[PDB]
Design a protein around this nucleic acid. Structure first.
Lengths: 95, 81, 91, 106, 104, 95, 79, 100
DNA sequence: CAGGATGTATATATCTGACACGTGCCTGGAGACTAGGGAGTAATCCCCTTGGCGGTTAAAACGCGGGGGACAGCGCGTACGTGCGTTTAAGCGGTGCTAGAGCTGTCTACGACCAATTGAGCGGCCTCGGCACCGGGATTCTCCA
DNA sequence: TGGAGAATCCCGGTGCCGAGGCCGCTCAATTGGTCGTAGACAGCTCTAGCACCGCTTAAACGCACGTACGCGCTGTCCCCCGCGTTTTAACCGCCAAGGGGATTACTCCCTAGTCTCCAGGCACGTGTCAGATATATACATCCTG
């Protein structure tokens, strides 16, 4: 069993890549079932739902990078959701 | 009905955190991260549905979504034209 | 050299008829009301610009206050405003 | 008569109309748009001095200092979410100390 | 002839003029304002496209992909300062790894 | 049928001006298009803001170089006012 | 020289309002530096606002719109 | 002991309560005036200032510093600590978007 | 628990200058009146969105074993903290002043409005080669004996 | 240390569809003229900023010491990482149908713009009382006991 280095190996595999990360049809069903709340039998466009894809990816990797720096300040390599709480508190979304 | 928000998966979250650059990830961060993405989707999608509803439209084109992420200053490129 | 003094003063007299307000708090009030004024008017101008509709009217500013304020206050202000415009179009 | 009295409102509809006319938002202005403007701003200032009068009432003063404005904005969650990026002048900071900040064992 | 050739520019003084006319930002305009606007957009587009060409040529690429313009903006300080609150579509992420997570 | 207005072929000409052996993509063309009218929106709106400060209806080169003072970093801005003055003097010297 | 005029008990009082008991000795000078960066940005926007409309003095309106440009809008001084 | 000595932390609690209660002036204003005139003639000399202007920048700096200091405080509690380090305020400046 | 020992909430005596009311003069607010193009409304057509099924196959779910990080506890060094005396220059009062912001007035040039004129520009259709993909070998480094 | 293998980098062919390039049509760009209207500038007014001076005084400054918190060490436990088999369900290409976006065409309303009258809103003056300040007393803490 090969420990540790495969994590940094896929770090380097994913930081050069440009492909999409959330698989698109779960997200497509998600935006359908959340837009069912506001207005029923509502319609979409493919460019629009890729726009939600791109915005969600950019926001989430910004969140995860801030979480990494929170963990480095915590003297930990493991991320824990109170770092998510701090990173949302930083943007003023919580307070 | 269904789960839907559980349609996204845990390896997708390891990919997303792996673009951010982590090594070790806890197993209890997934539900809270899904909730964070859910309320972010709330904050964009509400502006999206009223922007669709204003102009006699029941179909969301890309351009009003570009305006929706423009609204809180998280503007996106490559779709405004 | 105009301000928003006596309309908000008699609004305060209508809601809380037994209190006063200092000049600093009135400056806070005036800066608040003109700030939300240019915010909501800039959103209305963007809304008119967006869908090639060169006239600003009640439905567009209704959508503008849908965008500006969060949920509960948005429905309350929207309902109060349409009852006000219904009273105006009746009178 | 005045359009404020015709709509039963308080803010001047004609003043709002010409300020939005010469503030070059659009070159065509509808009829009920300044009425809707006056209604929503009078609703907003109604909540602001509602909470300000309450905060003065629990502070046993009758003249409103902007400290009462600060406890008016920062205590309502929805209005704090709306206008929380705005700095209120001489408003102070709310008393907020964490539980792991004060000494333990009473 | 045209105002683009009279100003020695490629961006349209006439079209920028007409857009800012019916975009009702002001009641009336001078003559030098669309020339100035065409000049500053020309300079910013030329600077970003020069950085994108550099980012293409060290990566032996001749068709410009969004990865290259993401390299153009995020590796330059004043482009980070002015392009701060944006999202680049299909552009990836700047590589940055902390030395703590690096082994040994 | 209608005229989809864009800025594509113009920066194609400036691309062949600066780098004669590089192509463009349609997607990259979309980020270029959205970027250029986005800067046009902020520069013209802030010029409108400075027009409304001074209570004038007349807008010209000087509040727009003040807008280059505002929404730009310093050394890029002073290069930009140099470029704008060079272009406007080349235009105004055309007898 | 006068940047050090923002004194250490003033940073202590600022920390007491902000919510801190224990402060470090290396805090205050770099706090003065980042505070100086903040007034650098605000004062650049204020001076180009002052110079654009041909005055040789700074009023309160233009620095309020400078913080409006910076997203830190302030009430109580017009605007 | 014969002389009264308050243990540390309690008077810190007294000062945070006393300073969150009031809205009194915090940073002393004439060194701030010398500071803005120093920066003003650093950019462009023979510039004048208004009093309402200088209290406007003073109150804006007060608000920015109390927000930053509360955030770096809660970061210090997040670091399993009760003291703020400079690396806490480095995290505050980096995370808030003011540095990167 | 417990007593004393201090900072602080309360309580009335008092004083002052901002706060709200009164006056009236005046510039926007409203009523009346005309007109024309923006948009309401309706009808047409066609992109383009949704649905759905099947072969393929890459990716997810789950189980297992372990080793390295998260955390609890500890122990020792000194860093501010608290409180005293010490030294400083902020702050109120008071006044001289002068410098430049603002109002008034008047000429003027340039920019909006209109018509007419035409090629820059933009969709449409054709052509080729840059690069993604299939397949294979050379190169690194990582972990086991 | 030496060696096995697991992925990464490079290398070559290829086939395609995405980008380049040329083409025909037309709508916005341009040429030219007018008229008036904010802009430029100068002259005057005067407010608000600037600046020395002393005096009491709050507040900064400096130091001792001590304590309890910052930080390194260590040990333990179990939490994820990593691999592998089984399972999941999503990609793509295909075919059908229609709701709704997009455009055109007509008509009328209501909103831009002038004129005229008028009163509410704002500069100015005011006298007064809510709240700042003061000092003695209860009270609610904390620290050694």
């Amino acid at each position: 069993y090969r420990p540790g280095t495969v994590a940094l190996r896929e770090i380097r595999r994913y930081q050069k890549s440009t492909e999409l990360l959330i698989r698109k049809l779960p997200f497509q069903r998600l935006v359908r079932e959340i837009a069912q709340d506001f207005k029923t039998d509502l319609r979409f466009q493919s460019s629009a739902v890729m726009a939600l894809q791109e915005a969600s990816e950019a926001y989430l990797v910004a969140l995860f990078e801030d979480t990494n720096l929170a963990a480095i300040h915590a003297k930990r390599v493991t991320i824990m959701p109170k770092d998510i709480q701090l990173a949302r508190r930083i943007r003023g979304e919580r307070a | 009905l269904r789960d839907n928000i559980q349609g996204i998966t845990k390896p997708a979250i390891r990919r997303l955190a792996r673009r951010g650059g982590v090594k070790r990830i806890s197993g209890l961060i997934y539900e809270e991260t899904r909730g964070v993405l859910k309320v972010f989707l709330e904050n964009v999608i509400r502006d999206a549905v009223t922007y669709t509803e204003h102009a006699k439209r029941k179909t969301v084109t890309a351009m009003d979504v570009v305006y929706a992420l423009k609204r809180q200053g998280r503007t996106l490129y490559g779709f405004g034209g | 050299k105009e301000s928003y003094a006596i309309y908000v003063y008699k609004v305060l007299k209508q809601v809380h008829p037994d209190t006063g307000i200092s000049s600093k708090a009135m400056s806070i009030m005036n800066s608040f009301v003109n700030d939300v004024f240019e915010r909501i008017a800039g959103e209305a101008s963007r809304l008119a610009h967006y869908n090639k509709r060169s006239t600003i009217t009640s439905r567009e500013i209704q959508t503008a206050v849908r965008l500006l304020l969060p949920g509960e206050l948005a429905k309350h202000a929207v309902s109060e405003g349409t009852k006000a415009v219904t009273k105006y179009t009746s009178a | 008569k005045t359009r404020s009295s015709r709509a039963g409102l308080q803010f001047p509809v004609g003043r709002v109309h010409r300020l939005l006319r010469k503030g070059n938002y659009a070159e065509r202005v509808g009829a009920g748009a300044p009425v809707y403007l006056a209604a929503v701003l009078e609703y907003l200032t109604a909540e602001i001095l509602e909470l300000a009068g309450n905060a003065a009432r629990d502070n046993k003063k009758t003249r409103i200092i902007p400290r009462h404005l600060q406890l008016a904005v920062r205590n309502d969650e929805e209005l704090n979410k709306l206008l929380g990026r705005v700095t209120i002048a001489q408003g102070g900071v709310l008393p907020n100390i964490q539980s792991v900040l004060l000494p333990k064992k009473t």
